Amino acid sequence: SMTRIIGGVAGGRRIAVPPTRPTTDRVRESLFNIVTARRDLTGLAVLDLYAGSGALGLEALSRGAASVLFVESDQRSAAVIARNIEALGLSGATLRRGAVAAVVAAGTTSPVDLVLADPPYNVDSADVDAILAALGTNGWTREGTVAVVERATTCAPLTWPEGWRRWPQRVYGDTRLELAERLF
Numbered sequence: 516s517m518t519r520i521i522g523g524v525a526g527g528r529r530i531a532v533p534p535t536r537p538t539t540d541r542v543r544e545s546l547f548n549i550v551t552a553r554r555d556l557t558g559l560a561v562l563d564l565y566a567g568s569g570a571l572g573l574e575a576l577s578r579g580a581a582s583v584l585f586v587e588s589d590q591r592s593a594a595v596i597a598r599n600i601e602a603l604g605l606s607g608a609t610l611r612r613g614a615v616a617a618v619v620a621a622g623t624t625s626p627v628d629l630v631l632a633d634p635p636y637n638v639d640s641a642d643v644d645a646i647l648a649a650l651g652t653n654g655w656t657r658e659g660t661v662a663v664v665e666r667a668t669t670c671a672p673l674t675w676p677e678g679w680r681r682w683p684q685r686v687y688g689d690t691r692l693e694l695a696e697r698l699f
């Protein structure tokens with residue numbers, strides 16, 4: 516089931532996927548429909564957590580985001596992300612191989628505008644709760660920053676920390692999508 520970029524300059528162009536448990540195309544089409552309805556991506560900086568194939572970040576990249584930081588701990592997955600960045604031939608992509616919770620913990624001096632996260636099933640939801648909290652204090656978020664998390668309906672829902680305003684939860688087949696934005 517080889518996936519392809521949905522919208523943007525790279526619309527239609529194919530990207531590769533590792534082995535894994537990746538996002539369905541309707542989930543990706545819908546997430547960007549939701550996000551792009553309420554923000555324009557052009558000039559926006561993006562953080563893609565547990566990037567896997569990079570499909571989500573390559574999508575935002577295609578639709579005009581300025582930069583995407585892909586964070587992914589598996590080396591074969593990081594290689595797949597790099598191949599895909601090359602095949603699409605778009606600028607602004609940076610790749611950071613490492614443990615997502617370690618990277619988020621280490622902080623940053625420049626906030627992003629959209630955080631994309633697809634945590635694998637070995638990650639517990641309460642630990643994802645901790646990453647969302649860290650996004651707020653460790654410099655990753657600014658006022659208006661959107662966060663989106665994809666999980667299996669099997670998984671326990673997220674508990675968002677103060678300072679975030681939840682958007683309406685969505686479900687697609689057996690996948691839950693949670694969205695919020697920073698208030699600051």
Ligand SMILES: Nc1ncnc2c1ncn2[C@@H]1O[C@H](C[C@@H](N)CC[C@H](N)C(=O)O)[C@@H](O)[C@H]1O
Nearest residue numbers: 537538565566567568587588589614615633635
């Ligand atoms: N601490 C971790 N940090 C970064 N990546 C991880 C970590 N734990 C597991 N992963 C990887 O995160 C990815 C989770 C995937 N479901 C993401 C899929 C991706 N969004 C896609 O549809 O292509 C897998 O590639 C894991 O190897």
